[PDB]
Amino acid sequence: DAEQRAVAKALFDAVNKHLSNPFIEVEMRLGQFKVEEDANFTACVSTEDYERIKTYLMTEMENSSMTRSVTHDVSLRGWRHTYATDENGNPTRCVSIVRKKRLFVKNIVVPLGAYNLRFAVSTETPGDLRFSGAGPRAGHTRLKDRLSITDGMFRYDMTQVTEKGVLMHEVEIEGVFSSHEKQLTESWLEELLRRAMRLATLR
Numbered sequence: 001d002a003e004q005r006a007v008a009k010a011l012f013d014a015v016n017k018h019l020s021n022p023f024i025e026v027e028m029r030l031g032q033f034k035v036e037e038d039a040n041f042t043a044c045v046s047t048e049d050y051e052r053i054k055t056y057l058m059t060e061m062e063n064s065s066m067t068r069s070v071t072h073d074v075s076l077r078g079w080r081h082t083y084a085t086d087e088n089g090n091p092t093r094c095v096s097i098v099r100k101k102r103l104f105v106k107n108i109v110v111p112l113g114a115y116n117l118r119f120a121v122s123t124e125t126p127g128d129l130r131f132s133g134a135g136p137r138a139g140h141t142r143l144k145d146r147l148s149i150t151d152g153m154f155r156y157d158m159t160q161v162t163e164k165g166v167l168m169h170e171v172e173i174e175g176v177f178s179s180h181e182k183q184l185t186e187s188w189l190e191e192l193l194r195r196a197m198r199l200a201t202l203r
């Protein structure tokens, strides 16, 4: 609780220099190390821990605004094209192209038995929509079924991702700001840690 105030300060001092950038994004991702063979950190939760994080979140903030969206992502030469989805789950029309550049990443120390936490600040710069002419299947694809709960300046993202047949579960919290420069504060970061640590520690 005092040590949590210190981490929040350490995070703020590292990222403050970046908030002047347009299109800045901040997120905390639950995950684990050495759960797949090619990767170090994998941003995923078990099917069981996903559904009780879902039950927790949906009772604790039932008043909160909520949305659900199915989208079709295709990665192409470092850019991400997002496609809307029809009844069956198939790509229709491209809705956004962004390029994501990681500006700062930090691994958060967690309690024993909890999911690992990864804090990242990046830029997601929108792009020229005429590149959508490459179509929804010009590269590796990800079908995302996202549940989104917004609570003040915090958005919870629970996503069932189907890639290459296998389905995985992702849990992240993002910053929701009218202006990241003014609003993303140290006291905000400390609440991010507090809320993210809650999710990581059930059971």
Ligand SMILES: O=C1CCCc2nc3c(cc21)C(=O)CCC3
Residues within 6 Å of the ligand: 076, 077, 078, 079, 080, 097, 126, 127, 128, 129, 131, 132
């Ligand atoms: O929108 C832009 C800006 C110009 C450079 C650029 N290059 C690529 C894309 C998008 C953009 C893609 O969507 C994937 C292919 C490479």
